[PDB]
Design a binder for this molecule. Structure first.
Ligand code: HEM
Ligand SMILES: c1cc(SSc2ccncc2)ccn1
Length: 465
């Protein structure tokens, strides 16, 4: 219609700030959607953004017009350090170049293959030892899980795992959890609107920047070490591979393979390969203790298909529809990245009689699809049946989009699914979950919701079975 999607009239500079609640962006947007429709325009400060709500609107854009919506938008906090470099926040040629290399290199190191499956199984065994080590005490699982998860991707990018005792490793994981939570707080979402000003003011954002610089510094050190010990004929990990390609691209003035893209791309994979799976696992166990009946059914299936002796393997999932449904329901309820990572229209285009000019930022509301009442009967309830038919067999859903969809969807989905199944299964096979409080007093509502969905802090006991 030559006109952008409908939305509330914005004010100079602050945009629609007054009609939004930074502490509850999702609820604020859904409220506006009820008045303007499933597809609308919003102004986060001066950033004009088109919001897509519900399965239909999201799929039509990201898949039906995949190319048109294949551009990458921004996440102001992360942009502070990335500045458009690296695979995640890059665009155009840089994006096509870095993504293609990352996926291939990832495959070269076992992802999607027996190689990484064995890596995950071994790390899962280390988690089991670590959990038995607690002696059934009631502890905070947070870093036990993130250390295990992080060691998988760390093996690939750094060529080796971290010792669970390594204090520098714990420091890194704390940096990641800190940034992740900051982007999900009110100040974090306020930052998304007013970064032009806030990046220069005192406040929590400065601490978040500190944590990003800490992470970047660690990667820079790793790169330098690999540089002065590199064997161009035999790469030890993702970093070496990128370094070799960089050597080959030296006589190319326009190459995308240079130090800054190496540092940022590796940072993307280190953070990306750690925080979301870790958060999903953490939310998952809380959900299971909240619903004892589900844990019991999971135990019945594991003992039947796998038993108590052997280590779970990825091929076991095809014989475990219940576990498969439980994990899917954990990702659906968890809604870890509720508004996905912002996209951007790559070229002027028409969408549902709306005119979207090149460069227009887009917010695919994944959370609104994971809870779309047209695909799930009681979207607000944690219920594995959402992914099972009456015969107890696994039932797929077009609205299951926790990894998003389209041209810039998560290429870490393969690794993540294998980690979620092996870690969830191996932990449940060996332990019974014991909550600190009664199932009735357990609060599963999120602590923060912004860029991500963060579960409340909690402690628990892992009692051997
Ligand atoms: C349960 C875990 C995970 C969730 C929920 C998740 C979610 C997402 C989402 C929603 C996106 C944005 C997609 C889009 O723009 O349309 C994405 C991007 C991405 N994810 Fe993940 N992810 C997970 C795990 C992984 C893992 C394990 C890695 C690391 C190997 C990873 C790396 C990436 C990368 C590199 C991108 C950017 C892709 C691009 O811009 O082309 N993710 N992820
Ligand atoms: C820095 C921050 C992020 S945001 S957390 C995340 C997003 C998508 N997939 C996994 C983790 C991703 C890559 N690099």
């Amino acid at each position: 219609k030559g006109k952008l999607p409908p939305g509330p009239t914005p004010l100079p500079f602050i945009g629609n700030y007054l009609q939004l609640n930074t502490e509850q962006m999702y609820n604020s947007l859904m409220k506006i959607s009820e008045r303007y429709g499933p597809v609308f325009t919003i102004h986060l400060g001066p950033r004009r953004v088109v919001v897509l709500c519900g399965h239909d609107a999201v799929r039509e854009a990201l898949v039906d017009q995949a190319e048109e919506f294949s551009g990458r938008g921004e996440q102001a906090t992360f942009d502070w350090v990335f500045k458009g470099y690296g695979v995640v926040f890059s665009n155009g040629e840089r994006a096509k170049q870095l993504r293609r290399f990352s996926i291939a290199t990832l495959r070269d190191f076992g992802v999607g293959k027996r190689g990484i499956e064995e890596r995950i199984q071994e790390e899962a065994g280390f988690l089991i030892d670590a959990l038995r080590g607690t002696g059934g005490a009631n502890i905070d699982p947070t870093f036990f899980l993130s250390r295990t998860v992080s060691n998988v991707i760390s093996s690939i990018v750094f060529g080796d795992r971290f010792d669970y005792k390594d204090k520098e490793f714990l420091s890194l994981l704390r940096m990641m959890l800190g940034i992740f939570q900051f982007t999900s707080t009110s100040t974090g979402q306020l930052y998304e609107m007013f970064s032009s000003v806030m990046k220069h003011l005192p406040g929590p954002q400065q601490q978040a920047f500190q944590l990003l610089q800490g992470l970047e510094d660690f990667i820079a050190k790793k790169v330098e070490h690999n540089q002065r010990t590199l064997d161009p004929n035999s790469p030890r990990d993702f970093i070496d591979s990128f370094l070799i390609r960089m050597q080959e691209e030296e006589k190319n003035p326009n190459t995308e393979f240079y130090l800054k893209n190496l540092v940022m791309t590796t940072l993307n994979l280190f953070i990306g390969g750690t925080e979301t799976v870790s958060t999903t696992l953490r939310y998952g166990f809380l959900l299971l203790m909240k619903h004892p009946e589900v844990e019991a059914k999971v135990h019945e299936e594991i003992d039947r298909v796998i038993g108590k002796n052997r280590q779970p393997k990825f091929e076991d999932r095809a014989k475990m529809p219940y576990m498969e449904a439980v994990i899917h329901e954990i990702q659906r309820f968890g809604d870890v990245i509720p508004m996905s990572l912002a996209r951007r229209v790559k070229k002027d285009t028409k969408f549902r009689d709306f005119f979207l000019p090149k460069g227009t930022e887009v917010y695919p509301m994944l959370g609104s699809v994971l809870r779309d009442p047209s695909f799930f009967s009681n979207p607000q309830d944690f219920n594995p049946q959402h992914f099972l038919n009456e015969k107890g067999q696994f039932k797929k859903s077009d609205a299951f989009v926790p990894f998003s969809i389209g041209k810039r969807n998560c290429f870490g989905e393969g690794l993540a699914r294998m980690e979620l199944f092996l870690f969830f299964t191996t932990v449940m096979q060996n332990f019974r979950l014991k909550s600190s409080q009664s199932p009735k007093d357990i609060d599963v509502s999120p602590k923060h919701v912004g860029f991500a969905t963060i579960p409340r802090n909690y402690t628990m006991s892992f009692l051997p079975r």
